[PDB]
Amino acid sequence: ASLPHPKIVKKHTKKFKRHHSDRYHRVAENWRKQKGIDSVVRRRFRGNISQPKIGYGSNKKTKFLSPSGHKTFLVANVKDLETLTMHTKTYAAEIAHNISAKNRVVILARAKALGIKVTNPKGRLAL
């Protein structure tokens, strides 16, 4: 029950991992560009890891879209939730990570009354 959209195509689903991050613990997986003049990764030899570039950019008609077809909007309270009262078919609300369970109950009740989709309705509310 979202806005009709074309099929969502991801050009590169795999994560871009930094070179030698699998080799050394001190090298994190956060992507860094290799600046070495003799780097085979920088020179793009066959068999090495892929590198991020603008060709992998996603379609503008499906960018920032969840698999259900909505754009995620963070909400912390009822006033934040009610900003999406008219944009129901395009935006889905996600409760912020630091919202307590007592306020999450109120947010879920208000979203159910307004017909607004909630991405994470089970959080902190186990029965």
């Binding site: 806005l3 009709p4 909007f73 963070l74 909400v75 912390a76 934040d80 900003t83 008219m86 944009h87 129901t88 078919k89 395009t90 912020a96």
Partner: protein, 155 residues
């Protein structure tokens, strides 16, 4: 506020589609699919069995009969791309198949199916009995043997 509201929102009015220029025209069957032709079933529950093609239906399907008395295949629909048309042909002018169609075969035993099966199979057997060994041929099943090349076989 956990997230700032965006300035611009898309309109939620779903647009209509453009006027499609794709007209529905009737299917042109293969030239070897003539009513009364013996067909070999390639797939399904009755795979490998030989039936008789009777009528071309509106939903691009072929009406076929075993006949039910010979090999146990009732009045069914088959897909034209899942059969092999042989050179063997029987006369079908004595069979009245004007009743059967998509609404007849819609599933949403009635015994109307049984009565129609008997009525068709009487004329079918009457025509089949003129050719020797044809009834035994229809009761037998088809299968590929060792060394059989379908690209070289004649049907």
């Amino acid at each position: 506020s956990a997230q700032k509201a965006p300035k611009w929102y898309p309109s939620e009015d779903v647009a209509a589609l453009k006027k499609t220029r794709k007209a529905a025209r009737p299917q042109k069957l293969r030239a070897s699919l003539v009513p009364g032709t013996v067909l070999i079933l390639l797939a399904g529950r009755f795979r490998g069995k030989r039936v008789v093609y009777l009528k071309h239906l509106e939903d691009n399907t072929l009406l076929i009969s075993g006949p039910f008395k010979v090999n146990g295949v009732p009045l069914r629909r088959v897909n034209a791309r899942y059969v092999i048309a042989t050179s063997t042909k029987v006369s079908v002018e004595g069979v009245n198949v004007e009743k059967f169609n998509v609404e007849y075969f819609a599933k949403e035993i009635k015994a109307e199916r049984v009565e129609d099966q008997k009525v068709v199979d009487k004329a079918l057997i009457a025509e089949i009995k003129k050719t020797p060994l044809l009834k035994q041929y229809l009761s037998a099943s088809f299968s590929l043997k060792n060394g059989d090349k379908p690209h070289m076989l004649k049907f």
